[PDB]
Design a binder for this molecule. Sequence first.
Ligand SMILES: C=CC1=C(C)[C@@H](Cc2[nH]c(/C=C3N=C(/C=C4\NC(=O)[C@H](C)[C@H]4CC)C(C)=C\3CCC(=O)O)c(CCC(=O)O)c2C)NC1=O
Ligand SMILES: C=CC1=C(C)[C@@H](Cc2[nH]c(/C=C3N=C(/C=C4\NC(=O)[C@H](C)[C@H]4CC)C(C)=C\3CCC(=O)O)c(CCC(=O)O)c2C)NC1=O
Ligand SMILES: C=CC1=C(C)[C@@H](Cc2[nH]c(/C=C3N=C(/C=C4\NC(=O)[C@H](C)[C@H]4CC)C(C)=C\3CCC(=O)O)c(CCC(=O)O)c2C)NC1=O
Ligand SMILES: C=CC1=C(C)[C@@H](Cc2[nH]c(/C=C3N=C(/C=C4\NC(=O)[C@H](C)[C@H]4CC)C(C)=C\3CCC(=O)O)c(CCC(=O)O)c2C)NC1=O
Ligand SMILES: C=CC1=C(C)[C@@H](Cc2[nH]c(/C=C3N=C(/C=C4\NC(=O)[C@H](C)[C@H]4CC)C(C)=C\3CCC(=O)O)c(CCC(=O)O)c2C)NC1=O
Ligand SMILES: C=CC1=C(C)[C@@H](Cc2[nH]c(/C=C3N=C(/C=C4\NC(=O)[C@H](C)[C@H]4CC)C(C)=C\3CCC(=O)O)c(CCC(=O)O)c2C)NC1=O
Ligand SMILES: C=CC1=C(C)[C@@H](Cc2[nH]c(/C=C3N=C(/C=C4\NC(=O)[C@H](C)[C@H]4CC)C(C)=C\3CCC(=O)O)c(CCC(=O)O)c2C)NC1=O
Ligand SMILES: C=CC1=C(C)[C@@H](Cc2[nH]c(/C=C3N=C(/C=C4\NC(=O)[C@H](C)[C@H]4CC)C(C)=C\3CCC(=O)O)c(CCC(=O)O)c2C)NC1=O
Ligand SMILES: C=CC1=C(C)[C@@H](Cc2[nH]c(/C=C3N=C(/C=C4\NC(=O)[C@H](C)[C@H]4CC)C(C)=C\3CCC(=O)O)c(CCC(=O)O)c2C)NC1=O
Ligand SMILES: C=CC1=C(C)[C@@H](Cc2[nH]c(/C=C3N=C(/C=C4\NC(=O)[C@H](C)[C@H]4CC)C(C)=C\3CCC(=O)O)c(CCC(=O)O)c2C)NC1=O
Ligand SMILES: C=CC1=C(C)[C@@H](Cc2[nH]c(/C=C3N=C(/C=C4\NC(=O)[C@H](C)[C@H]4CC)C(C)=C\3CCC(=O)O)c(CCC(=O)O)c2C)NC1=O
Ligand SMILES: C=CC1=C(C)[C@@H](Cc2[nH]c(/C=C3N=C(/C=C4\NC(=O)[C@H](C)[C@H]4CC)C(C)=C\3CCC(=O)O)c(CCC(=O)O)c2C)NC1=O
Ligand SMILES: C=CC1=C(C)[C@@H](Cc2[nH]c(/C=C3N=C(/C=C4\NC(=O)[C@H](C)[C@H]4CC)C(C)=C\3CCC(=O)O)c(CCC(=O)O)c2C)NC1=O
Ligand SMILES: CCC1=C(C)[C@@H](CC2=N/C(=C\c3[nH]c(C[C@@H]4NC(=O)C(C)=C4CC)c(C)c3CCC(=O)O)C(CCC(=O)O)=C2C)NC1=O
Lengths: 164, 164, 164, 164, 238, 177, 177
Amino acid sequence: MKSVITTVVSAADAAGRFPSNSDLESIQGNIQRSAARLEAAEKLAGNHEAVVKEAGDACFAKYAYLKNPGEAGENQEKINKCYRDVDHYMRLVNYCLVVGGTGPLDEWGIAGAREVYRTLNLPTSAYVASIAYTRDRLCVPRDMSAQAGVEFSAYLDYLINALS
Amino acid sequence: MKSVITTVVSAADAAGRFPSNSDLESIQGNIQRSAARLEAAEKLAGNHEAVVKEAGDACFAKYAYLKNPGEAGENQEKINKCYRDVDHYMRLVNYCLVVGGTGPLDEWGIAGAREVYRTLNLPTSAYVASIAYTRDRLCVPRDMSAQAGVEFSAYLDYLINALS
Amino acid sequence: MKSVITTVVSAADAAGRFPSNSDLESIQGNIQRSAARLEAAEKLAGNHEAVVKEAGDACFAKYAYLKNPGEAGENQEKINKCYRDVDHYMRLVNYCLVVGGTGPLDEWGIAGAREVYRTLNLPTSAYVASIAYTRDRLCVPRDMSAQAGVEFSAYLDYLINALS
Amino acid sequence: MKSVITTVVSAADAAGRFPSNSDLESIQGNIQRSAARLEAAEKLAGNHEAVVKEAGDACFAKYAYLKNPGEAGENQEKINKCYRDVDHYMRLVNYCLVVGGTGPLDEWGIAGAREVYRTLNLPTSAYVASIAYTRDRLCVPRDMSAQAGVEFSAYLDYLINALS
Amino acid sequence: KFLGTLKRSKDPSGLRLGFYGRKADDFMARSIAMQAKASAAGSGVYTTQCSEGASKGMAENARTASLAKQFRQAQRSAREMSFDYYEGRKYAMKAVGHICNYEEKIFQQYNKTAAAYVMGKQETLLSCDRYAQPANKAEEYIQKSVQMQMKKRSIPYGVYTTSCADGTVKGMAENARVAKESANFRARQMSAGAKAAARFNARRVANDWHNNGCNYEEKLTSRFPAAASSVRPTTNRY
Amino acid sequence: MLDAFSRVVVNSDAKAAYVGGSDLQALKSFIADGNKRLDAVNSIVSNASCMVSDAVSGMICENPGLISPGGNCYTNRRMAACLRDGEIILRYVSYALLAGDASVLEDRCLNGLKETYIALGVPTNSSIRAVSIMKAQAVAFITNTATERKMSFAAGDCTSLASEVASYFDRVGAAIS
Amino acid sequence: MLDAFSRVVVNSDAKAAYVGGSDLQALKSFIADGNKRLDAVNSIVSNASCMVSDAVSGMICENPGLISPGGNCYTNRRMAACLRDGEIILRYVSYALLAGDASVLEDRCLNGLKETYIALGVPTNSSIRAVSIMKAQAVAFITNTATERKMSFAAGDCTSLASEVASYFDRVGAAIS
Ligand SMILES: C=CC1=C(C)[C@@H](Cc2[nH]c(/C=C3N=C(/C=C4\NC(=O)[C@H](C)[C@H]4CC)C(C)=C\3CCC(=O)O)c(CCC(=O)O)c2C)NC1=O
Ligand SMILES: C=CC1=C(C)[C@@H](Cc2[nH]c(/C=C3N=C(/C=C4\NC(=O)[C@H](C)[C@H]4CC)C(C)=C\3CCC(=O)O)c(CCC(=O)O)c2C)NC1=O
Ligand SMILES: C=CC1=C(C)[C@@H](Cc2[nH]c(/C=C3N=C(/C=C4\NC(=O)[C@H](C)[C@H]4CC)C(C)=C\3CCC(=O)O)c(CCC(=O)O)c2C)NC1=O
Ligand SMILES: C=CC1=C(C)[C@@H](Cc2[nH]c(/C=C3N=C(/C=C4\NC(=O)[C@H](C)[C@H]4CC)C(C)=C\3CCC(=O)O)c(CCC(=O)O)c2C)NC1=O
Ligand SMILES: C=CC1=C(C)[C@@H](Cc2[nH]c(/C=C3N=C(/C=C4\NC(=O)[C@H](C)[C@H]4CC)C(C)=C\3CCC(=O)O)c(CCC(=O)O)c2C)NC1=O
Ligand SMILES: C=CC1=C(C)[C@@H](Cc2[nH]c(/C=C3N=C(/C=C4\NC(=O)[C@H](C)[C@H]4CC)C(C)=C\3CCC(=O)O)c(CCC(=O)O)c2C)NC1=O
Ligand SMILES: C=CC1=C(C)[C@@H](Cc2[nH]c(/C=C3N=C(/C=C4\NC(=O)[C@H](C)[C@H]4CC)C(C)=C\3CCC(=O)O)c(CCC(=O)O)c2C)NC1=O
Ligand SMILES: C=CC1=C(C)[C@@H](Cc2[nH]c(/C=C3N=C(/C=C4\NC(=O)[C@H](C)[C@H]4CC)C(C)=C\3CCC(=O)O)c(CCC(=O)O)c2C)NC1=O
Ligand SMILES: C=CC1=C(C)[C@@H](Cc2[nH]c(/C=C3N=C(/C=C4\NC(=O)[C@H](C)[C@H]4CC)C(C)=C\3CCC(=O)O)c(CCC(=O)O)c2C)NC1=O
Ligand SMILES: C=CC1=C(C)[C@@H](Cc2[nH]c(/C=C3N=C(/C=C4\NC(=O)[C@H](C)[C@H]4CC)C(C)=C\3CCC(=O)O)c(CCC(=O)O)c2C)NC1=O
Ligand SMILES: C=CC1=C(C)[C@@H](Cc2[nH]c(/C=C3N=C(/C=C4\NC(=O)[C@H](C)[C@H]4CC)C(C)=C\3CCC(=O)O)c(CCC(=O)O)c2C)NC1=O
Ligand SMILES: C=CC1=C(C)[C@@H](Cc2[nH]c(/C=C3N=C(/C=C4\NC(=O)[C@H](C)[C@H]4CC)C(C)=C\3CCC(=O)O)c(CCC(=O)O)c2C)NC1=O
Ligand SMILES: C=CC1=C(C)[C@@H](Cc2[nH]c(/C=C3N=C(/C=C4\NC(=O)[C@H](C)[C@H]4CC)C(C)=C\3CCC(=O)O)c(CCC(=O)O)c2C)NC1=O
Ligand SMILES: CCC1=C(C)[C@@H](CC2=N/C(=C\c3[nH]c(C[C@@H]4NC(=O)C(C)=C4CC)c(C)c3CCC(=O)O)C(CCC(=O)O)=C2C)NC1=O
């Protein structure tokens, strides 16, 4: 769990020091952020399913070979398991979008990405090509402005960064 | 050095993680406190010497025994060494008052306070009684308001906290 | 516990060696000092209370500021707590005076002298000025001679040494 | 090097403590044993060679098989190397006899006794049977009394103890 | 050869290999240590694993005590210095188990890289004495026996040798004691996730590094892993 | 870890009162025979190697059930382990002897020990047999009451010194039980 | 780590010959003033806190260039570090004093030390100034030749004892140089 407070009070913890005016100033940036960094949660609280179904077939468009035999996404039930897999991804992006860190990602999104796509033959290239196609859908029209829309990008991008 | 950035980028350092949207929100609180937390520097940039000379003789008033033989502040040159010693203290308070931490205190003010008053027989009680008398001189009249005057208190008080 | 035997048998212990004619010669010096080093116990087994009440007001004489407000020894009950505090000190001196070490001091007198006078604002200068005034009361008249009177000094002095 | 001072000042060293009245009493027993514990040096400063040549042939008497082929002490040059080997032994006994320890033994006599008689096939039984025959030659007639003669025994005996 | 530049008596340490390689070695050892410190804090938190201090003094006194211990490594005899280089090669090859033909020829060209690697690997693989938690009363006893056995390296024949000098003021003596059981309490403090894996980490470390055989005594290690964790048989002279 | 001088001083902290001039006279009775104790414990380290060599040979001769397979001293490594477990008793009781005080036992060896011996399946009766050998080794060695060992000391009493060491192996046989 | 008794015994191993009855008479001359040495070194630990308090105050008063920024004792942590680097000298030379033998210096402190001081940029002249303070502190303290400190001992000579300690700080000023 990777919030700013999880950093700074564990810093004074492993210091053993007093919680002095070292750690106090850390929270108010996240507090000031509460006007910006968590306002990108409601835009996909309106679009839960309506972004992963248009990203996943785009991934299947650039990777049409997935539906062959000898692949992962061969038939439609593996297509549903694709459509929930990316759902879990930007789900956790919307999770870390309200914490002050990537704690839900760093415990549940990208930690342990080593063999789950290696042994199961899932292309992490296909995952990042699906979720990077979600990234250019950020614009000041029909979202809120770049005061708040950019933290979505700032949280999906680390998912790219440790997936790819 | 104990600024909020020294916490959060060393957090991602000892993480080894990417500088994701965990550490980004930390700075803007210090940035918004550039309207408040460092505006208490100019009030003793007007009163450099004019507060320690009225605090130190107040310490000598509540502790008149200091000027005896067999003490520390016996004669006037030890009184000058008193008047520079507290000068160093609220000097470092005005230092940490512009950093986002108590880094100058935690390296230079209160770290290593163990034997410098133990072997040299200096009463740390007299030090905190001198500098607590500086604390009630904060008021919205003739300072700026408690948006900015309180961070002075918030930085001298940790000096009390590790001195006493 | 810091007797000579606590040194030498723990030496052969952490050696794992046999208790050879290394450790044998250690005890007989303490045995010969049973004629000298513990004969300074009865002189304050006659003067239990009769030395701390004349040392403590002498400390209050050189430090008359103690009875002010804002101090430790403000009123008479803190004066009684002073008079038992130094009682504990030369009590433990008379304790280590019969052990062959400063074991009662090194566990109970001066170990942990770090914050008990720092946070409680007690001047350790006042403690050593009280107990050094007890030191020049050693003389061959009305004590026994310097065969035995000097071990009192040799045990209060380490109390000075780690208190001051 | 295993003197009493090598114990007690290294004790305060690995303590990091002050050289207090813990370590002071250690030396005066060795100082009082300068009347006793090193007076057994001159009795074989008169008998250097005159004890090892009568111990070694006694070892050869109880072990006459040594002079056979297939042994260590087969011919006379190995007999000379026997006669210097035990010379080194009670030489080092006379060395540790003046130090306050078995430092010359514990570095040079019995430390490293593991393979020097194992690989070289030397019977350590024959060594201790040679040097135990030197032990009953201690008597108050024609030595000094058991105030001083016993420390010889007290230093050859540890040579038995780690050789055998 | 009168008045030759070379001197018969002085003090080489061995391993010198030129001046420029000394700035190389400590820096390789530094980033190996950073790689080790990126594991137990290795997600973003600073766990009670590292635990620099406990109070006012216990922060900055653990500084100068560690700097003291680093100095005590510097002022050793050429005998033990050479011996430390010699054991460091043979132990650093017993680190990953594989003869990595590049990363073996690092650690036999280099030693404080090797020493730092062995230490930092023993810290993330929590197989250490300061992470042991013996539940059995039989386990604490044998843990004690191994601890007593270790002193035989420090104390060869009866004297303490400045290898457990542990801080050199009146105060520096007492602070090491409280800093001991501050961390020794934190051995039973962290989580059920960790410190159940320590019992398996000493099962990864002591069974194969130091004791290749002794199956009747290797079954003691698999019986009592807390005693097998506190065996500490790398010769740090401590 | 603690000695006979400070044995009374933890009791004197237990009252929080001053030590007398009378309570430390027991230290004088302890203190006159100090040179007796040093005439004794050198004989405790006289033939301590022969003492333990005597001990496990004299323990194994009435019970060679340990030399049976599965018996605890069949294997020579188990035999040397038995020697190692035995020699520290000769260490620890004489640390207490020169202490005049039984403090080195309970903090260095006694705790967690019979728990290991039942964890290792060590027969405790063999160990109490070996330590009871030692209890009569020691009182014979402090006197000249040995068969060939004549450690001639300054003449007189060591029954105070014999009762001291006899007050030490009892706790050894107790704590391993 | 090594003492005055065994100082001659490494030399006696250096010949591989027996110690005499004559060569150990220097130990008797060392040994008669042993109680003198203990009447001395208690005064070395008499006001050792005041000694070092005197030492760095009396070193900083002729050279307050260390109180300048960048000067080695400007920072109070550097000042306490100076106290720490100073107090171990008072430890180590008196370890050698009670040794009667300069062995604790070269194995515990002297080696690798000026290399650290030039590695840390420590001014060596300030340290030789502080240790030369100590060399005259010690001979004043073993006598009653102090201003207010009257450590009255059994009367007579300690110039043997003064030449002993004066034969100790010289190696301290030498090895840090
Ligand atoms: C909490 C967070 C969380 C996640 C991040 C995901 C991660 C995840 N994905 C799968 C499992 C899967 N994930 C996919 C998805 C895909 N395969 C591909 O080749 C494409 C790249 C992509 C579709 C576009 C598929 C097809 C499976 C089933 C294949 C398999 O694992 O056997 C499984 C195991 C379940 C199973 O085997 O079916 C898990 C844990 N699930 C979670 O619960
Ligand atoms: C960078 C930060 C910084 C500080 C915090 C101070 C801390 C500090 N104070 C003193 C030194 C001193 N400080 C005092 C002050 C006092 N003594 C008392 O008993 C009263 C409580 C108080 C006066 C009211 C005195 C009298 C001395 C000189 C006494 C001495 O240290 O010998 C010294 C050593 C210099 C000297 O010995 O003179 C240092 C480093 N100085 C610094 O450079
Ligand atoms: C076993 C050993 C042992 C000791 C060494 C002492 C140490 C000691 N002193 C005090 C406590 C005290 N000690 C003093 C004494 C003095 N204060 C001063 O400023 C003067 C220097 C001096 C009188 C001359 C006073 C006034 C208190 C009470 C103040 C306080 O601690 O709140 C306390 C806590 C009890 C309390 O808070 O009242 C303890 C443990 N007591 C012991 O049991
Ligand atoms: C500084 C301390 C010191 C010592 C303790 C001795 C120890 C010692 N002994 C021998 C060497 C020897 N020591 C002996 C002696 C004996 N062999 C026996 O079987 C009998 C028990 C005994 C004669 C009674 C013999 C015969 C050799 C030569 C055999 C050999 O080592 O090859 C050697 C090697 C030299 C050589 O090989 O010749 C050394 C170091 N020497 C020392 O310098
Ligand atoms: C500058 C060079 C240099 C190094 C690489 C490292 C050494 C090193 N290797 C690994 C990590 C590893 N090290 C190996 C070892 C090897 N891999 C093989 O296939 C070879 C057979 C063998 C020698 C290269 C393996 C297989 C891993 C991954 C699994 C593991 O963590 O052990 C780790 C843990 C960090 C990680 O998991 O990546 C470290 C510190 N130190 C250094 O100073
Ligand atoms: C994530 C990586 C990581 C580490 C490896 C440790 C490294 C480490 N160890 C210690 C401090 C210590 N570390 C050890 C551990 C050992 N000493 C040895 O000789 C063995 C090799 C080893 C285990 C038996 C011990 C015994 C101490 C205390 C004394 C000392 O410093 O040596 C300290 C000082 C702070 C403290 O722990 O109290 C640090 C940072 N910390 C970390 O965060
Ligand atoms: C570290 C300090 C220390 C002790 C407190 C004692 C206690 C003790 N004994 C053993 C372990 C043992 N101790 C014995 C000894 C005996 N079993 C018997 O039945 C006889 C009564 C007796 C011999 C006369 C045996 C046989 C083992 C097990 C060795 C084995 O079976 O391989 C161990 C495990 C490893 C070790 O030897 O250290 C310990 C801690 N021994 C020690 O070394
Ligand atoms: C609590 C866990 C625990 C262990 C697993 C063992 C492991 C062990 N045994 C020995 C002790 C020994 N170790 C060996 C080595 C071996 N003996 C053999 O039968 C094999 C050939 C090889 C197996 C590794 C030998 C021969 C000794 C006895 C001599 C010696 O001390 O080196 C040592 C060196 C310290 C010592 O005991 O002196 C260690 C660490 N001991 C323990 O206390
Ligand atoms: C069951 C098989 C069995 C044995 C192996 C022997 C061993 C043995 N010896 C003694 C008895 C003793 N053992 C010693 C010890 C020694 N005596 C010496 O002459 C040496 C210096 C030293 C090592 C041998 C002493 C001094 C006594 C008492 C009197 C005596 O016999 O000397 C005892 C009784 C314990 C006691 O009284 O102290 C036993 C069991 N006897 C047996 O019944
Ligand atoms: C550090 C080394 C060291 C020693 C080796 C001894 C040496 C020694 N032993 C005794 C003296 C003695 N030792 C004994 C002991 C015994 N007598 C016997 O007949 C039994 C064999 C044995 C029982 C254990 C007795 C009885 C005395 C005489 C003391 C007395 O009778 O009061 C004395 C006389 C001083 C005195 O006791 O007051 C001395 C110097 N002392 C030491 O300081
Ligand atoms: C530059 C500023 C300056 C000072 C701060 C004082 C400090 C001071 N005192 C002494 C000189 C001394 N200082 C001591 C030390 C002490 N004497 C005592 O009575 C106490 C027990 C103990 C702590 C104060 C002793 C014993 C002497 C020599 C004789 C004496 O004056 O007592 C010296 C000379 C060094 C020496 O001779 O040893 C100096 C510089 N003098 C100065 O010129
Ligand atoms: C471990 C045993 C030990 C030593 C052998 C000495 C030597 C020594 N000095 C320093 C380190 C130092 N020593 C000094 C002391 C001085 N510099 C000066 O210019 C003056 C001459 C003198 C004070 C009077 C200073 C100022 C530092 C560096 C501290 C710093 O700058 O932060 C260090 C590094 C860390 C440490 O303090 O341990 C060591 C090992 N000090 C020790 O603690
Ligand atoms: C373990 C604790 C312990 C002590 C504290 C001393 C206590 C002590 N000091 C001296 C005795 C003495 N001490 C001194 C020393 C001095 N005299 C002076 O006038 C100077 C002030 C000072 C110089 C340093 C002298 C000169 C003697 C007399 C010895 C003689 O003259 O031969 C004696 C007499 C015995 C003797 O010296 O032979 C004793 C018991 N001894 C100890 O065993
Ligand atoms: C070389 C002898 C030596 C040390 C070691 C350190 C020890 C140390 N760390 C500290 C304090 C501290 N501790 C941590 C966390 C800590 N840092 C990490 O890299 C990891 C993995 C950690 C878990 C324990 C941080 C981030 C700081 C503040 C910055 C720092 O001082 O390192 C503090 C002082 C308290 C403070 O700074 O406020 C000290 C003394 N200092 C020394 O002089």
